[PDB]
Amino acid sequence: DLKGHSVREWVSMAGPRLEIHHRFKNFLRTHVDSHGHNVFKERISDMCKENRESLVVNYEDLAAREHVLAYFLPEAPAELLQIFDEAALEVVLAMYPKYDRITNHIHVRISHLPLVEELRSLRQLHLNQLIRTSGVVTSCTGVLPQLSMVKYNCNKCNFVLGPFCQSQNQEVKPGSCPECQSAGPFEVNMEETIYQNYQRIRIQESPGKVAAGRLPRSKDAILLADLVDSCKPGDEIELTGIYHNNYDGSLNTANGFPVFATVILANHVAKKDELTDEDVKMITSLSKDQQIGEKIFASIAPSIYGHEDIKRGLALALFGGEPKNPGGKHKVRGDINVLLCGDPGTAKSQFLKYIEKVSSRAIFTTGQGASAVGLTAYVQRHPVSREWTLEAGALVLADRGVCLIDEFDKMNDQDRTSIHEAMEQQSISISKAGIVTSLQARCTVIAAANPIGGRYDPSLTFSENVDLTEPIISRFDILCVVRDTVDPVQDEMLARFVVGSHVRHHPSNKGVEPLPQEVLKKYIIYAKERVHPKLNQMDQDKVAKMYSDLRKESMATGSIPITVRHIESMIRMAEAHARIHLRDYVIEDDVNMAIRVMLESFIDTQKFSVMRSMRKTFARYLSFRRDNNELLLFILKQLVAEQVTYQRN
Amino acid sequence: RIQETQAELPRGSIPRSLEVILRAEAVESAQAGDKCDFTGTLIVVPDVRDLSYRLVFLACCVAPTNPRFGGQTAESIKNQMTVKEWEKVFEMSQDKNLYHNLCTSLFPTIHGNDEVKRGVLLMLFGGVPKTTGEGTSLRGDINVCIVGDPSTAKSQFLKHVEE
Amino acid sequence: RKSQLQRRFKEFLRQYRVFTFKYRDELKRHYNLGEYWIEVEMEDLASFDEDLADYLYKQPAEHLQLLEEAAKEVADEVTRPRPSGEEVLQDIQVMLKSDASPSSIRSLKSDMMSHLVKIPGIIIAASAVRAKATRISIQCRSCRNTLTNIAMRPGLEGYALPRKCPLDPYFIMPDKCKCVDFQTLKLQELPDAVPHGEMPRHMQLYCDRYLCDKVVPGNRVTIMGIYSIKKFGLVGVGIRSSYIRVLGIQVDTVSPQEEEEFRRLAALPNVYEVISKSIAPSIFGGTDMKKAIACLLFGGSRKRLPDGLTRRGDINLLMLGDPGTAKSQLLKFVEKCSPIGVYTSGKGSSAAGLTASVMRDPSSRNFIMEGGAMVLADGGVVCIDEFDKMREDDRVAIHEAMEQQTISIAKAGITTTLNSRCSVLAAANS
Amino acid sequence: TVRQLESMIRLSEAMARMHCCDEVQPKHVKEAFRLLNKSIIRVETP
DNA sequence: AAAAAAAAAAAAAAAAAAAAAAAAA
DNA sequence: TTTTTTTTTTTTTTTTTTTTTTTTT
Ligand SMILES: Nc1ncnc2c1ncn2[C@@H]1O[C@H](COP(=O)(O)OP(=O)(O)OP(=O)(O)O)[C@@H](O)[C@H]1O
Ligand SMILES: Nc1ncnc2c1ncn2[C@@H]1O[C@H](COP(=O)(O)OP(=O)(O)O)[C@@H](O)[C@H]1O
Ligand SMILES: Nc1ncnc2c1ncn2[C@@H]1O[C@H](COP(=O)(O)OP(=O)(O)O)[C@@H](O)[C@H]1O
Ligand SMILES: [Mg+2]
Ligand SMILES: [Mg+2]
Ligand SMILES: [Mg+2]
Ligand SMILES: [Zn+2]
Ligand SMILES: [Zn+2]
């Protein structure tokens, strides 16, 4: 239909306007599919059923069926899109006549626009055109209510004025009221006015796409009444919208050039990136595998070789225990805090990052200030929103999740106090400006740290070769002492692992089976939300005798003793292990495994001599579920290492 | 916004900055930190009424002050070059012992310290950055540190690399 | 007609029963007490006349005015006979509450504007009580006539003076205008409801006559109000900052029968034993320690001699032991059981100092008192864990406070002595 | 530690880049290993 | 006892939100 | 006369520097 003088003026005329209207209606009715007969039929049906008041329209099919309309679309998006909305409204009414009571309007969204540009490539030539870009949302305000159909109220004669439709370009100015013909001030009439949601976001170039010697560019976009809340800061989004320019933006103010600000009137948003059913069958299907414990323990941080015990501890921490407060006066936490202390170059931060990735409501912070959110609460005006807000500490943000703390031994005094408070009383008390409040932070703390001097020395007990006071360490349920000891076989294996990773992740090329990560987190969700094991089958006799023996042995030597909190931690870990298997009743094997883990941690926290003392004295407990091959391999490795040391000295 | 070059700075004076203005086509040819030559016209912009004027440069073209190539992917860079430049580059690529030649040429005035020269050369080249399936970023740029007694030509290595 | 709606509200107030008429008697007692306000349960209104409640939910602005007028008339009808000097009837603020579960702040879209909305939150700032005019009088400058009783709209809605009796000849007489209390609060979304990676949203609350200072920053609150925008003489275009008109506030977290219960509980021969075994039942052993903690909880008696000197009556207890014994648990119970109690560590707590501090706001130049655990715990118990790891300033401060019960602070602005009458229960390791 | 393996891989990559080679031959790995070994210095003491 | 690092004070700059007055037509 | 743009003022916050204080050899 190429004809005339101006594209926008061509659509402006009533003739082609109605021609396009009816052609688009016929396209909606007739364009069916290759095989999905009348996609728009079920589309509109679903939209009306959920009351979505929107219609995403692919550009490819619209161009195929009606090439003229698709060509006209990007040149003058406003008029074509308004016509499409008008057409779709009556199409919906024909399909759903009663739906006319709902929103009295339908929005048309267009997706898969062929030509996609970048924020740095925007030019004046793109003014007033439908354009598709990609970017990261760097800021987003609240859902501000914007005037849609105002009804100003004349003061002198108290007569409400008719609906003056609000334009996104200019603020509406009322004339003189028809009744008393007064051009007075007038005021909005909120009760009779109708509004529309108005959100303002900023979209910046993806850092992975910016060139070497260039900085990312940003553009402001306006989401209106249905795209609101479709984005959050940090989202990678494909945005299709109108590169609008003419609202009020012109630096006519002194000391200013005739520049024009630009905002993208958003028309479609697509984020480029868990309440299911019948997956309970899936989770239960492998829950009865009878060896799922090994599978899950091997399915943690698959990019980290070895460190199986650390992976087991992290699994137990993930599934968690059972918080219980007998009466209301004995608060016992159901969490399993974990501390990984080890010499550098052992992938502790890798474990913390994996937990960040795999666990919902999981936040990451560092002892240094290099983390986005700090450990301590405070109140201030947020730098980007300029609004006075109570910045709760990181621990609070992970109220029911996981807080990962890297560089646990490099915190501030106030950071140490805050972590102590959170770990002890499971809450934070703020009295900073005038906010005398106490908000609870029931987080599981997974911490990573290096030993004093950069190397862990087994000749010294754990509590003394770490820059942490005894009270802090006393609140961790598992202590993992990661040691980097020279071992040719393990060194070769790890070298092969990492070098193969490097090979496989080159830009050009871009004893059980671990569960897929998505299914692993589904399993974690279901177990952590549904099964609540009760320890009605624990053998009090065995636990009591074990505790008494450990007390006697630890006090027989000048070593850190065993205390009640160790029994508490063993109970929590047994409950967590039961939760992994969804037993709903802690079983003898669960208790034995929890004892194994707790004794391993407690023994490894001891000095070198006491290490062997307690190993030999309690080897039976520490060998539970540890087959003969593992112990034999460990002993052979010890013997050959002794031989090597004798050789090379 | 630009500022005066170091060579032009008179004794004991801060650099001068005059905000140049770019228009269509040549609207992003200059990036922060680049040494650029701007060709155009000096103009006055106003900042009963008062005539307060400020000088501002309006540039009709922007080009690098010291062009690298006389003429981003490997082939694109290759075509960016002239015939003679590519002849030189290909010749040195086939030049056996190019390692020592680069070491000597890059640091002619620094005696010995072959290891540090090799380190900074490999630094100038660097590794290959990579991205993991989980999204982890594999660092592909090598850093270097130099520690030792004074007058060991450390700041000289830094200045060589900078210049 | 609106008169019919007000009549129906009058009938609901006068004749709603439960027998006893709750609201009639509530009006009687409140007006006699001078409260001049009532708390109307939304569900009772809906049950008695569901149309009224639906109207309130759809058009709160004028229906609440009708309800207030009806309540005023009913109060007059129930308490008209008054002594000379106060017979003038008093308007009545009508707070309304309901059991409906609150709606998350994220659901306050544009559509809910001007509807009655119930949302939860945490108040992070409260402004001082001020004066807003409900009835103003304007006097012409030229003719000096008066236009008394110019009705003023509630909420953040100013008013434009008349232009014609010169032009704009009117000025406001402060001495003749009636005003009421006024306050603005900042409500943040509850941190639990905030999505994982997401900023907390905000809202601005506007209180009224008797709602002012019913909350203090830090309270966890449920607010039922009218979602409203500012109305002040009319790249974002046509955006009017939105706020909530507070109508009902619920702050989340002794009868004579209970007094007699306490009397008989004390009279028991073994009251001491039952109290001793009734503090840390979960914790095993340490009967003497539990008895001592009960004694600390009840405290001695403060004595002020005729010379004015004071003898503290609050017991201070210390517990040194190995880190195995349940003593931090004991402190947690004590802070959970004492009438006024606060748990803290030796180095204060998380963004909550131990002892009070005084700083002068360089801009407003006031004397801001940032209260530590001690002053907050006045008249109660402070449970200090890791009591051996204080800081020198705090060590001296507690040195003074535990004996004198007062913290003396003198800054570049002023000298003062905050009253910290707290019983200290300290835990420590060797 | 393993970070030295990362450094060795990166140095081999840079060595390959120097000659504009497309695959890291063993000679580049040998040169990177030699340089990194020299960078390590023994802590002599009386 | 003296130096190195950290914390707090204090002063200057910026945003900005709103009320009032002078200049323009 | 009536609007409008500016003018201020009145708060508040933020950033740099300096000074003061705390910890270590
Ligand atoms: N067991 C392992 N399996 C796989 N890769 C490993 C393993 N141990 C170390 N690496 C790799 O070696 C490098 C060093 O690990 P990483 O950077 O996580 O150190 P770290 O333990 O966090 O040290 P630090 O305490 O210094 O922060 C990483 O590239 C990591 O992928
Ligand atoms: N091996 C060397 N060969 C050539 N010049 C050297 C050498 N070592 C030191 N110098 C000279 O010594 C001067 C001072 O060295 P400099 O780099 O300032 O010491 P530092 O590393 O302590 O800063 C330099 O100007 C440099 O020319
Ligand atoms: N006598 C006891 N009765 C009941 N529980 C105890 C007893 N002693 C210790 N515990 C348990 O041991 C754990 C350690 O107690 P805690 O008060 O944290 O020690 P500390 O005060 O040294 O930190 C607590 O969780 C507590 O439940
Ligand atoms: Mg690390
Ligand atoms: Mg130097
Ligand atoms: Mg303790
Ligand atoms: Zn009128
Ligand atoms: Zn008059």
> Which residues from 382-411 of A have any strand E atom under 7 Å from their CB?
386
Distance C173 CA to ligand 8 centre (A): 15
Distance (Å) from the C-alpha of residue D18 to the closest C-alpha of chain A? Answer: 18
Atom in ligand 2 nearest the alpha carbon of residue B156: 17
Measured CA angle at B131 (ends B125, B133), to 5 deg: 155
Q: Label the pairing between strands B130-131 and B137-138.
A: antiparallel
CB contact under 8 A, A502 and B33: no
Distance C391 CA to E5 C1' (A): 19
Cross-strand partners of A199: A223
- Which of chain F's bases lie under 7 Å from a protein CB? 1-3, 6, 11-15
| Number of residues that this document lists for chain D | 46
- The CA-to-CA distance between both ends of chain D, in Å, stands at 27
Distance between CA atoms of residues C207 and C102, nearest Å: 19
First and final CA of chain A: distance in angstroms?
Answer: 92
- What is the distance between the alpha carbons of residues A397 and C190, in angstroms, rounded to a whole number? 11
- Burial class of residue A563, CB neighbours in 10 A (0-12, 13-18, 19+): buried
Interrupted backbone of chain C, residues before each interruption (C–N > 2.5 Å): 18, 165, 234, 253
Q: Is A281 part of the contact surface with chain B (CB cutoff 8 Å)?
A: no
Token pair recorded at residue A87: 């057409």
Query: Shortest CB distance from C191 goes to which of A392, A421, A469?
Result: A392
H-run or E-run covering A97:
none
How many helical (H) and strand (E) elements, i.e. helices and strands, does chain A have?
A: 21, 18
Q: Which residue of B has its CA nearest to A303?
A: B134
Give C239's contacts in chain A (Cβ within 8 Å): 144-147, 198
CA of A184 to the centre of ligand 8 (A): 18
Helices (H) and strands (E) in chain D, counts: 2, 0
Nearest-CA distance A16 → chain C (Å): 32
CB C412 within 8 A of CB C359: no
Contacting chains of B (3 CB pairs or more, <8 Å) are: A, D
By the 10 Å C-beta count (0-12 exposed, 13-18 middle, 19+ buried), A567 is classed as middle
- DSSP character at residue A160: B
Within 8 A of B99 by CB-CB distance, chain D residues are: 18, 31
Number of CB atoms found within 10 A of residue A126's CB: 18
User: Among C116, C186, C237, which would you mutate to test the A interface (most chain A Cβ atoms within 10 Å of its Cβ)?
Assistant: C237
Q: Residue A518, exposed/middle/buried by CB under 10 A (0-12, 13-18, 19+)?
A: exposed
CB within 8 Å of C371: residues ≥ 6 apart: A431, A436, C356
3-state secondary structure of A377: coil
Give the span between the Cα atoms of A630 and A615, in whole angstroms: 15
Alpha carbons C120 and A59: distance in angstroms, whole number: 43
Q: Taking Cα atoms as reference points, which of C359, C384, C380 lies closest to residue C369?
A: C359
Q: What are phi and psi of C424, to 5 degrees?
A: -95, 125
Is D18 within 8 Å of B125 when comparing Cβ atoms? yes
Q: Which amino acid is at C329?
A: Q
Nearest CA to ligand 3 atom 26: C326
**CB of A77 closer than 8 Å to CB of A242:** yes
Two structure tokens written together for A215: 């900085």
**A345–chain D Cβ distance below 8 A for any pair:** yes
Name the nucleotide nearest C364; use CA and C1': F11
Kindly state the DSSP code that residue C278 receives in the 8-state scheme: T
Here the tokens at position A93 are 């009414």
Name the CA dihedral angle for B19, A243, A74, A42, rounded to a multiple of 10 degrees: 150
C412 touches strand E (CB under 7 A): yes
Closest listed residue to residue A235, CA positions, set A159, A139, A334: A139
User: Residue type for B5, please?
Assistant: T
Residue A152 near residue A189 (C-beta atoms within 8 A): yes
- Chain D residue with the nearest C-alpha to that of B126: D14
Cα distances from C25 to residues A88, B13, C77, C255, C256, in angstroms, run: 58, 86, 12, 20, 21
**Annotated binding-site residue? A350:** yes
Q: Tell me the DSSP string of B51-100.
A: --EEEEEEEEEEEESS-S-----HHHHHHHS-HHHHHHHHHHHT-TTHHH
Strand E contact with C367 (CB < 7 A):
no
DSSP bridge partners of A616: none
Determine contact: A503 vs chain B, CB below 8 A.
no
d(CA B40, CA C352): 62
What does the alpha-carbon distance between residue D36 and residue D12 come to, in Å, rounded to a whole number? Answer: 11
Cα–Cα dist A217/A232, whole Å: 18
Using CB atoms within 10 Å of the CB of residue B70, give its burial: 0 to 12 exposed, 13 to 18 middle, 19+ buried.
Answer: exposed
Inter-residue contact D11 to B127 (CB < 8 Å): yes
10 Å Cβ neighbour count for B30?
A: 20
The sign of the CA dihedral A417, A418, A422, A423 is negative
Instruction: Chain A: give the shortest CA distance to residue D4, in Å.
Output: 9
Q: D13 and B127 in contact by Cβ < 8 A? A: yes
- Report yes or no: C247 and C224 within 8 Å, Cβ to Cβ: yes
Q: Measuring CA to CA, how many Å separate A447 from each of A333, A461, A467, C127?
A: 17, 19, 13, 41
Token pair listed for C21:
């008429």
List of residues 6+ apart from A555 with CB closer than 8 A:
A561
Resolution in A: 3.4
Give the technique used to solve this structure.
cryo-EM
**Phi, then psi, of A61 in degrees rounded to 5:** -65, -40
Strand A444-449: give its sheet, edge to edge: A362-366, A402-406, A444-449, A338-342, A478-482
CA gap C73, C66 in Å, rounded: 11
Binding-site residue set of B:
111, 151-155
Instruction: Tell me the three state secondary structure of residue A17.
Output: helix
Is the minimum distance from the CB of C161 to strand E below 7 Å?
Answer: no
Please check whether residue A428 is in contact with residue A422, taking contact to mean a CB–CB distance below 8 angstroms: yes
CA-wise closest residue to A311 among C140, A277, A303, A165: A303
Report which residue type is found at A179: E
Please list the residues that pair with A444 across neighbouring strands: A402
Which residue in the block uniquely carries the two structure tokens 């014994």?
Answer: C325
